[model samples]
Target: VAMKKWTAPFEPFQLIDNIYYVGTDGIAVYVIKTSQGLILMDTAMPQSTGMIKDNIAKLGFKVADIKLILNTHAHLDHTGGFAEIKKETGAQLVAGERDKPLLEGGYYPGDEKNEDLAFPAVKVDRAVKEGDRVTLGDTTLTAHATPGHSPGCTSWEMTVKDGKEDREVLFFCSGTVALNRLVGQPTYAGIVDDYRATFAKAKAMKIDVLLGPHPEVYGMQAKRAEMKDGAPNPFIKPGELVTYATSLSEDFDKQLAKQTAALE
Candidate 1:
């Protein structure tokens, strides 16, 4: 069950100032060091849960100090370590309101019976809707309910320091319609509509640094390699959200049309 690339251990590095990239080569989990305690963003696969812990340790941070365990969505890939890590750290798991069932049940929507799509069930201490804020210590992240990939796919927004200037980062929730069925049974009731809203919301938003659940979504490796002292940050693209979201929306139309036709 080992995905060589997705589960492969990646060198943990400082993303910006207090933000750290502690995920694997494919998945992108993050740790935010704050004045009060550590804030863990998400986790990798079930097999890579130990890998995530090691990555946190490699950055010289302790998992026990993490006060908040925030999730982007309830997918098995992202929520794999939630059950164990949250128990060990005693951190409150906070996530999108609609995805609570998926997280707590540890099952995939529209495919609950499949064991392959299941992860360890974890409790969601706080169920947040759009505009809800999760604050731990000095850091506060505003939630944007960007549902589409899942029923409550949330994208978190925060401000971080880039050099001497402040930059806005949106941990963009995915817009991909991966295993979701848009036409017939559908993943959830309003799954198709949720995607349309997400893409539109993403396009209208202004994000300086666009990060996501997966590394490839933001070309993390190439950008991380390009990072150095006294140079402009490669991750700081002001118009990336529009360019990306627009393209995603366009592709969504194609996929929707294709799937709709398949139903006929």
Candidate 2:
């Protein structure tokens, strides 16, 4: 299943008026078209660079038109193609301030050098912090620091036109708690508090459309299949982020308890 999702060809589709989904079944790459150019968000695994480029071209956009490369975090799965994409388009790369070191070092939180998780070390042109706005053309996305999955995890919020109304869209970083040590020695500094605070912020956020690093986080597979011409936008779910955060927090509590017990 993993190989199939990674290698399978996913037809690129427009998610909204100016935002298009140019990713695979496993990962997510969003193309935000602006009057100035385009912003490419979250390149998948390093090996998947070719596929991502093809997806963008399939959407009638030139790969060279990409003016900026951004990410939800510095995880390999999301940032592995940063160097490749940057080389291809000469676009400036921007990342969260906290994840800058991880990106440049090409290592995970535990300081391990696993080939699967490691990617080419790329320099971040700009380091963004909480409340910083990444603007391009007429669009602006507000960055919010929600570190946990990684020390520099970031979630982005912006408003998009959904017909006659403006809808709030959130590109959530992550809350998976994957491959991290929760007890004994923490995987990253202040991970526990960061996760807790992130969950609270996610729950309190008002989101009309909830997106994530992975397609599964927002039911992309099913929703994509259900979408029809002239149909209402299937991605709009006002309170989805709150519900997602609630479940994530519950899982975090469970993991913390289990790890704490094991430590005891």
Candidate 3:
């Protein structure tokens, strides 16, 4: 027997107190509730728009109440539903400065086959720089520019209350060298240095709850399975970020060596 494509609807569930997971098993989309409104992080694939809306509705959240649209990067898989979601909710779309053009053009860097990488081009309402804080109601998330997976890869940091303690949460962007060239003509300008800096920065950051654009980044499947009543929060792994960063950095070195050898 062969395995079927996993398109089964992922029932929306609260990951923490106010953060809800409303995306598929592969992609990750989160809804953070605030007193002012809702902040949606990363819209999944363009075709997943309707499913995302349905999941939000199932969670008793008014889709129209989404006030801010944020992204992890400009990848089609992540930002593909941005235009539709922004148009429907009239929310302000925000992204890292380096990715604004890619987002607005709905194309990957150096690739112009529009339809292949297309989503409705949505204008960014605000472009943020590193250390910029996006605040809504009482919740605030600081944007950390961690480029290289894409030129404007962004990671976000915030503090969420877990019972009597405060947990530092990080939403990490991609660092993998997927379809990217590291030697000779690079995927983007300054690609090598940016990845190095990003890995170093990620390793130095303090994280308690490690969330990411993909569930596999933080072992979401294993952690989710481990979740149960009164079981210690599987999401709160303090040293996970260090391990993840080390793994990514090691992979980056391997890819660099392979690409360099090819160029030689």
Candidate 4:
């Protein structure tokens, strides 16, 4: 039910210089055009695979040019199309090292037996840790460890030119609780600490443009609709990540207490 609801088609458009939005109405897939070729970001759902490719083509870009496949986390919603897309492009798949097994297994880490949480497994070409740099052509993205929603939940940071200015961009890996077990049978060991550290780490980082896997988290559609000609890019908001991270940290407190109380 949930997956079906988030599969609605979204028109592809350029978000800013070199970075284009080629995802669905709910999920956001990014395409970065570099000097050499295209760097494709996370895939939405298996059902949306065709839409994703079509959307890329509609942007006047060929999928065959995609050389690298990047991921934020190992979630079914974000990774459902990874296998198919990888097959078509033969791109090198890179993700957080802790999630390599999860991606290869094609199952949610803690809930391995549930078919609903499984996706088509894809091969991982490179595994990354914090501060690892993934570069292709002239573009380079630095990995920031913000584990919580998933072990090795990595937030990628990069720079994009916004009208003669280099704006720092961060594809912040999710911080939402979403189906994760915090206290009792934690989704993974140290989940609580991982969440806390994620909030702190994300907030402390310097980001001029804060984007995410899911568009709603950062009001992506709203910002895109607000983009006007010769007007300052609406997405370039310094300290936006701090505001979002702060709210998530507060919500984590409430969730931890609620989950803990249930056990007592």
Best by lDDT: 1
**Candidate 2 C-alpha lDDT tens digits along 1-264:** 436775567789999768899999888889999989999988988788889899999989999989989889998888878998898889999889999998898878785668767889899998999999999899898899999999888898888998889999888999988778887999887899999999999998889999998888998888888888888889998888999999899999999998899897
Could you tell me which 10 consecutive residues in candidate 3 have the lowest summed lDDT? 1-10
* C-alpha TM-scores of all predictions: 0.97, 0.96, 0.95, 0.97
Residues 54-155 of candidate 3 have per-residue lDDT tens digits of 999999999999999999899888887899999888999989999998899998776658576677789999899899999999889999999999888889
Cα misplacement distance, residue 127 of candidate 3 (Å): 0.5
Q: List the residue pairs that clash in candidate 2.
A: none
Lowest-sum lDDT 10-residue window in model 2 = 1-10
Between candidates 1 and 4, the lDDT winner: 1
Looking at candidate 2, what is the lDDT of residue 98? 93
Alpha-carbon lDDT, every model: 0.91, 0.88, 0.87, 0.89
lDDT of 4 by residue, 112-181 (tens): 9999889999989999999999999999999988899999788998998987779999999999998898
